[PDB]
């Protein structure tokens, strides 16, 4: 359905009713002549600014647009003021004439005829007499037509009006007028046609058939003759245009007979597009039809083109796009342009000279004239109906494939596409990540397992490789655009806000010590100073106290002093020193040289800070050479060290922290630090992998990168399902090529054809998609072709502007790990349960691979494209038992459907996969990972991603957009292990090490780091369940695994000779042969049993959480053998009380013993604002008497308002792990009959007592002579040391704080 | 002018089982030219607004209603997952359909907050593209709101109607989610589509109902589906016989109503119904004298309108004046003036 | 289609029910939002919404919630008579 350079849309419509024509009576026209406005009555501005008064262009009306204007006036238009100025006056001094004779009250009734009112008018303006017209202003419309009713007077009536026996021959009337400032070229002007000139035509009335071929005779001899058929206005008529050309309108492709047709058929096919049953219009077909000098047999010409679209536009068609109602010249431009393409012209109706066919199918109408037959064509592929069109969109659109029976072979679709793509292309990256921080931190001090420095790892070999180098580099350009500096640093002093002392558990930090940024100050981005120090000055991070002064140094200071801190330095001594200074500035690669610096750095970076103070220091290269050294020379000069490290951008640097700068230190490298460094390494290796898919930046997309961009450009496409249609091949084999990501779709139009431009993202994903193809599918055509839309242009950005939510950060992650535990050689078989419509499941498994995938929905690719041996997909519901018919496999899956399927039965998990797991054991199955909710580490519910219900076992996703049910794990456990008590079970969760990561950037998705820590713990509580019948399971002795304990484990085995390993948050923690062993948690012995064909391991873990073993001989991969988890202690502190008699308000208070493991260090603090703070210990004292802690405490008036704690002590933070609150004070009375004591209950505390109903005191400020007994107390005993206390003689009094 | 009258019907409700073969069918002259011609003038004829946005509020109020009949607690929820699977068409001057701003504000009084909207359909821009008439790859949702036409590739061909109507109804019972709730819009509801209806779904869900807005003359209902379940046991009842009967009688009955209108573009000589008669005179002298032309020119033009109302004008030309008098002529009025054996003088 | 359109009765009884003193009793907040507070015999007693973390001597945070809407807990009371401000 398209005609040269036009598209047509299958459906055809045209309105159903002609409306009759009627004269003008005489009264209504004075009327329209008196109306006090004419402008929208006579003539219209289609062109007026309202900012001046001004317009350009004038469309006319029946009574003026008869007016031929005259040279002078053309040669010299006025300007719009002018215009209705002169308007104005002409048309009532016209009335005046037309009623000086002819009084309206004789003759009001009477009809104008429209030709002569038209030519009298027209001279009158054109300051020509008129007189010989009024004779004849009316006629009898029941006796005569308004052209018969002049041809009663055959003669020259006036030079430019002749009438003979049977026709009449005037100028065309002007239908625009331009006025001053007129523009052509200014292509957003309205475009007119050239009828604006005052002879671009001539038309000849005629009153009968003969009549008409004696003009044509004439006329035979120039140019060519054009007339309407349908509804000729005011009567039959030919018009016979100028033979000349007009400007502007194209590339001089005109001339004035084309424009004429041209503009027509444009008519004819807006009328055609918005025509209604309910409407009756004066004409159903607007076009003109050529009746002399004309070839039908060639189409080289415009106005044959035009006459071959008016042949065909007249049985009803519409044009995909709609078409101005005031067309400018731009838009003209664009219709002859399309029309002059190359293409096929129509011939579904052949050209007749005089007379026109009509399909009788069509909606089309003929009049009762004979100028109209109908005809049939062989193959017309139109049908009736109404088309309604849709505004542009301001995105480009994405599709989703659906795919027609038809496929077709690799080589074709790869030849279709290679000359339709844009191979190599420019695209953007954007940016990656997208803010946020990964940041960990690891206390050394605190691990007593002594570990020689000479064992530690060190850098990898290729660490300074120009390839990870260089990828290091382009990763550093991909985060978004901030001040790196600036939150590096505020994750640090978040951490040094809660440094606690261990020995007292009061801050380390105090409100006014002595800073300074030893760390080179160095006019970051738009300041002169590091950002943080306004932060830390204005007290903007929370719990850091304010520092009296700050001093900077460095080589880049401004504010401050330049020095080099590799020397000794004269300078003072300061509470925090804050060392962030750079080491690679003068050390590319030279290690030593690097390794020297830095130990010169810290040294001098202790020796600046006071005794009991705090030091930090930025490291750029962990080495085990730099460790040695650091033990060999500052072990002594602090009490603790732990490692603060956050992740902006992938690097190996690290901060070290050193609290309490003092002379006698014991600092030792301890298993800690073993810890830290390969979780370091190991991330640094999982963002590399994830990098090498991304191209470098100047390099044009050449289809080598794995996350590249492919794209396929077309021009006027018309898709169909018809065989070897280029169109479709090519969409098929892009889309084959992008299928897991999305695919983008634009429509341009250019000033000719419209451009169609298809695109996606390529990944190894998609690769791996298509290499299990075997015939490249066709799609459904409906929803492009449909579309007729116009888009923004593409714009081929690698990475989207916004970071994705957490939940698809878990779905890559176990992505991840299903596609690393289907690459076992030793499957031959896979069924998968509840697999989405769309099979993605594909794009994860080698090719190789047998799979066999279900869901109730009916798939949504098709299945001839692919291996039937390989592939296979069952419709149905695997929560029946009638599910399982014929079913066969060696291994199955369910990731994220348990839970809902579980739901949909309305059951608990435990009845659920009770009933599930036999079937699969009956299906010939052996092992499978299965994806149970259950909160493993422990119940805590995600503040808006998981709600956690506790009265009934389910989750609430999203707020509750989705509910499911859970069990607990312990239960879970024991249930399966009823089931098969044989075979072994393991857990996978999201690790640390972020290994996953190439499933979130290397398909093209970008990040914010901060969320990595929420999305693990979202893991944690929807773990994965691997479960191996092939395999005998794990077995330990002390069941509930109690932290820090001897415990013996076996792995039942055949072979002495294999190898074992343990991990833990995803790094090996232990491994080696039971000749020797090497641990990072405990002391480890490990022993093969010959006689019972075991490995012993006996093991004292120095850590929680889930701990993994595998075992592993020389020439196989290693082989899981189960997994355990280890329990922290328990958390129940208890304390015994003194009777009441023993309650002392006295001045010495009382004393109370505590029972609790020595695991957790005490101290007695306050809740005071979402934090404890520790009390003064004149108050309370958690003692360390030899055997056992105590608590002794003293009792004040203010007890019972207040509540305060037995708080966990760690360095990291006070009351962490377990806060005890101390209830009995909070409820203990005081005996009236004995002195009592009194004081604020908070640092700013304001407090007033009342005795009795009595007021008493402000105990802020008490009366300067106190109330008659009472005094000020000796021990403080207040809540801060600061306040005092006052003793009360007796009475009982009231608290208002 | 505005508003609605709309009508609920519900079917599960009623127990009395109905054989779908008995069903009442379209008219047989529905699609006859007249008629529909009638039907598009009818369209015309009402004040201009957004037609969708006042049929989508009336459904959306119904659905804020429903409860589930075993444990009377509504059906949708906050944060519920809703799939505007209808047509976003770029309505009007918005880029979606208006209804959503309401739906993601809340102004719809007791509907729940659904946690996010995916739209769907040929002229989407803030969704996909996607025909309904296949499997899709689009997941699953709570809330089904399927605002489809059948028409825009089905003139009057109503077998291929049925089928895309079919293929559409299918598909979107597969994107509910279990006890979710979908809603369809059907424009002609055959007793061939209902045949297959019963045929295939009847265990797809727990309730059905039927909500019918009345906007403009037209055949076209509203399916909900509650409690998408996989052993549901919906039949064809008495109920749904009600509601189609009740149906083509407002339908037959406006159609009448509209015959007396004239068409648009028809100058009105004197053959329409309701047309409008006048007549002009000059200066005229009213008197009762016999034969006064002014005098009985106006007791002409009042026989052939009182019972509508008479108006009046009275304009001053530069010479005389021109005074007009006029009204709407019914068929009451032809009524009473058949009545009349001689035209009183006024 | 909807709940109670068609009647709708009052639990006219439970609206005069008298509390015996004597015995351990039971409180809750009365609405979705409804924040609620209590008087011991004329005694403030507790802000129901936010009880005082040292709760007064005797009551509990009842097992069954039996409050209006199920999030909301029931604290039991061991005696007394109490008012309800909301």
Known sequence: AAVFGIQLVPKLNTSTTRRTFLPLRFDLLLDRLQSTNLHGVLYRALDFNPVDRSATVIQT??????????????????????????????????????????????????????????????????????????????????????????????????????????????????????????????????????????????????????????????????????????????????????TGDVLGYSSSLISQAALLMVESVMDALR????????????????????????????????????????????????????????????????????????????????????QILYWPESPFVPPIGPFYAPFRPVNFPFTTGSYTVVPD??????????????????????????DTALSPLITTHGFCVTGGVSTSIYDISGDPTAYPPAQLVDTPNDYFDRERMARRDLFRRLRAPADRSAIKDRAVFDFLASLVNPTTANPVLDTSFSMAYLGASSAHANADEPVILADIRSGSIPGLPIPRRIVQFGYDVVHGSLLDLSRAVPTGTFGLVYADLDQV??????????????????????????AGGVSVLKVNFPTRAFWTQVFNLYATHATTLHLVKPTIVNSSEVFLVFGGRQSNGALRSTTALQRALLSLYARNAAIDRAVTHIPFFGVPDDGTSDLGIDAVRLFDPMFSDAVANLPSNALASLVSRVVPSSIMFTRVPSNGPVSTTIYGKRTFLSNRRRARLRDVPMLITTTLVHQRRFTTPPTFTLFSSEAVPVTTLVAAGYNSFISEQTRNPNLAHLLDLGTGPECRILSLIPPT?????????????????????????????????????????????????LGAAAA???????????????????????????????PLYEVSSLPDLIDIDLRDRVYRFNGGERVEPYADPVPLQQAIAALLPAAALSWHTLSPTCDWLPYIIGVGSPLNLSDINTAISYSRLTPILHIDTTTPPLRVNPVPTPLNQQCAIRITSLDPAAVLSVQHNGVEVIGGTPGNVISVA????????????????????????????????????????????????????????????????????????????????????????????????????????????????????????????????????????????????????????????????????????????????????????????????????????????????????????
Not at 410 to 418: C, G, L, R, S, T
Not at 585 to 610: K, S
Not at 911 to 929: E, H, K, N, Y
């Open 61 to 242: 009306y029946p009574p003026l647009n008869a007016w031929s204007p005259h040279p002078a006036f053309i040669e010299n238009p006025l300007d719009y003021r002018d215009w209705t100025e002169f308007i104005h006056d002409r048309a009532l001094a016209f009335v005046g004439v037309l009623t000086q004779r002819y009084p309206l009250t004789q003759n009001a009734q009477r009809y104008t005829n429209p030709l002569v009112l038209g030519a009298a008018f027209g001279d009158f303006l054109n300051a020509r007499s008129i007189d010989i017209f009024l004779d004849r202003l009316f006629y009898g419309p029941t006796q005569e037509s308004p052209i018969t009713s002049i041809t009663k007077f055959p003669y020259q009536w006036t030079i430019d009006f002749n009438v003979t026996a049977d026709s009449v021959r005037t100028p065309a009337g002007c239908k625009y007028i331009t006025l001053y400032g007129y523009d052509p070229s200014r292509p957003s002007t309205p475009a007119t046609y050239g009828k604006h000139r005052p002879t671009y035509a001539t038309v000849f009335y005629y009153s009968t058939l003969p009549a008409r071929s004696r003009l044509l005779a004439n006329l035979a001899a120039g140019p060519t003759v054009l007339e309407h058929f349908d509804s000729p206005t005011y009567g039959p008529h030919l018009l016979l245009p100028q």
């Open 271 to 354: 009328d055609n597009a918005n025509a209604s049953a309910s409407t009756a219009v004066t004409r159903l077909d607007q076009s003109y039809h050529p009746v002399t000098s004309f070839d039908p047999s060639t189409f080289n010409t415009l106005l044959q083109r035009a006459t071959n679209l008016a042949l065909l536009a007249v049985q009803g068609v519409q044009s995909e796009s709609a078409i101005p109602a005031i067309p400018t010249m731009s838009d003209v431009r664009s219709f002859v342009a399309r029309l002059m393409a190359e293409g096929d012209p129509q011939q579904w109706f052949p050209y007749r000279v005089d």
């Open 393 to 418: 969109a301001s995105r480009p659109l994405r599709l989703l494939p659906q795919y027609r029976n038809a496929t077709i072979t690799v080589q074709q679709a790869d030849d279709a596409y290679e």
């Open 585 to 610: 500035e003068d050390a590319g690669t030279d290690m030593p040289a690097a390794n020297r610096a830095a130990i010169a750095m810290l040294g001098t970076a202790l020796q600046m800070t006071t």
């Open 849 to 897: 691979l047998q799979v066999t995938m279900s869901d109730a929905r009916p798939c949504a690719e098709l299945m001839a494209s692919f291996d039937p041996a390989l592939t296979a997909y069952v419709q149905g519901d695997y929560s029946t038992a009638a599910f399982w018919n014929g079913i066969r496999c060696d291994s199955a899956t369910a990731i994220f459907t």
């Open 904 to 934: 949909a039965a309305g059951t608990d998990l435990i009845a659920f996969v009770q009933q599930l797991i036999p079937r699969i054991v009956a299906a010939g199955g052996t092992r499978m990972w299965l994806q149970l909710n259950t």
């Open 1082 to 1297: 405990g002391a480890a012995a490990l022993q093969y049993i010959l006689a019972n064909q075991e490995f012993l391991l006996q093991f004292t873990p120095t850590l929680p959480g889930i701990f993994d073993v595998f075992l592993t001989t020389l020439g196989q991969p290693p082989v899981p053998r189960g997994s355990f988890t280890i329990t922290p202690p328990p958390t129940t502190v208890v304390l015994n009380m003194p009777p009441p008699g023993q309650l002392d308000f006295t001045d010495v208070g009382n004393d109370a013993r505590i029972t609790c493991d020595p695991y957790y260090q005490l101290a007695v603090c306050i809740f005071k604002d979402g934090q404890y703070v520790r009390v003064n210990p004149e108050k309370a004292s958690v003692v360390t008497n030899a055997p056992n802690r105590d608590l002794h405490f003293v009792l004040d008036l203010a007890d019972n308002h207040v509540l305060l704690y037995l708080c966990d002590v760690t360095p990291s933070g006070l009351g962490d792990r377990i806060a005890f609150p101390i209830v009995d004070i909070y409820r203990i009375a005081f005996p009236r009959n004995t002195p009592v004591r009194a004081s604020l209950p908070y640092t700013g505390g304001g407090a007033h007592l009342t005795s009795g109903g009595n007021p008493f005191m402000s105990l802020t400020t008490p009366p300067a002579v106190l109330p008659a007994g009472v005094a000020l107390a000796a021990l403080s005993t207040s809540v801060a040391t600061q306040y005092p206390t006052y003793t009360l003689p007796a009475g009982v009094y009231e608290y208002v704080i």
